[PDB]
């Protein structure tokens, strides 16, 4: 029934569409834009959480902490390029 189940994703296509409408980035928003944005956010979040989980396993902690997120972001060179001007609280 839901568009997320249609696209085989987990991020909410409806929520991404609502955020796109509320942000007022253009007068009309296409139908495929929320699906594509949800897919890209899926891939990015999956990669970031994979790296953070690798860091947590290295630090032998079962929980993920903003320090682990900072290590994950600043260890991978490409994600470092994307988020180089970012400072994370308690990191």
């Amino acid at each position: 029934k839901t568009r997320s189940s249609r696209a085989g994703l987990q991020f909410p296509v409806g929520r991404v569409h609502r955020l796109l409408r509320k942000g007022n980035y253009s007068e009309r928003v296409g139908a495929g834009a929320p699906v594509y944005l949800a897919a890209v956010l899926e891939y990015l979040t999956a990669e970031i959480l994979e790296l953070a989980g690798n860091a947590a396993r290295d630090n032998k902690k079962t929980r993920i902490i903003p320090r682990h997120l900072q290590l994950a972001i600043r260890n991978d060179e490409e994600l470092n390029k994307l988020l180089g001007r970012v400072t994370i609280a308690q990191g």
């Binding site: 903003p66 001007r85 970012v86 400072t87 994370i88 609280a89 308690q90």
Partner: peptide, 8 residues
Amino acid sequence: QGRTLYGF
């Protein structure tokens, strides 16, 4: 200023 901030 160019220095973003996550966590708040």
